[PDB]
Amino acid sequence: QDAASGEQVFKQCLVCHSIGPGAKNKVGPVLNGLFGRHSGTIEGFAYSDANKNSGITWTEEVFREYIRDPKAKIPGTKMIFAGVKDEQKVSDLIAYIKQFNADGSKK
C-alpha cells in the first residue's frame, strides 16, 4: 500500500518497537527485516514462550491475521495490544515495514 500512510499507523507501534537505522530492542523487539523471519529470533530480546515456540514464520498473510488480534493468534503473548482492525491501515502498515532491511537501511 502507501508507505507514507503506513508510517503514521506505525506511531502506535513506535512506543514499543524501533525500526530504521540504529534500531535497538525496547519493550518489543526491533522490526527491521520482519517479513520472512521466524518468530522469536531477534538476539537479545526476551520473548515469551508463547511467541518463541509458536513455529510462526512472518509472511504478510500471517502478519495480517496476527495484527488484527494478537492474543487470538499467539495466546499468552507479552504484546498486550488490541490490534489494528482497519484493512487499509494494515495494508499501509505492511508497505511501511517492508521498506526496511534487517540492518535498518531502506531498500
Q: Alpha-carbon distance 72 to 60, whole Å?
A: 17
Q: Which is nearer to ligand HEC, 43 or 107 (CB)?
A: 43
Exactly one of 6, 17, 19, 96 binds ligand HEC (CB under 6 A); that residue is: 17
Indicate whether 62 belongs to the interface with ligand HEC (CB under 6 A): no
Considering only residues 19 through 58, tell me which ones interact with ligand HEC, judged by CB under 6 A.
Answer: 27-29, 34, 39-40, 42, 47-48, 50-51
Q: Which is nearer to ligand HEC, 53 or 105 (CB)?
A: 53
| Grid cell at residue 87 | 484493512
Residue 71's Cβ-count burial label (10 Å; 0-12, 13-18, 19+) is middle
Indicate whether 90 belongs to the interface with ligand HEC (CB under 6 A): no
Question: Quick one: which H or E segment has residue 53?
Answer: none
Between the CA of residue 3 and those of 8, 15, 39, what are the distances in Å?
9, 19, 23
- Note the residues at the interface with ligand HEC (CB under 6 A): 12-13, 15-17, 27-29, 34, 39-40, 42, 47-48, 50-51, 67, 77-79, 81, 84
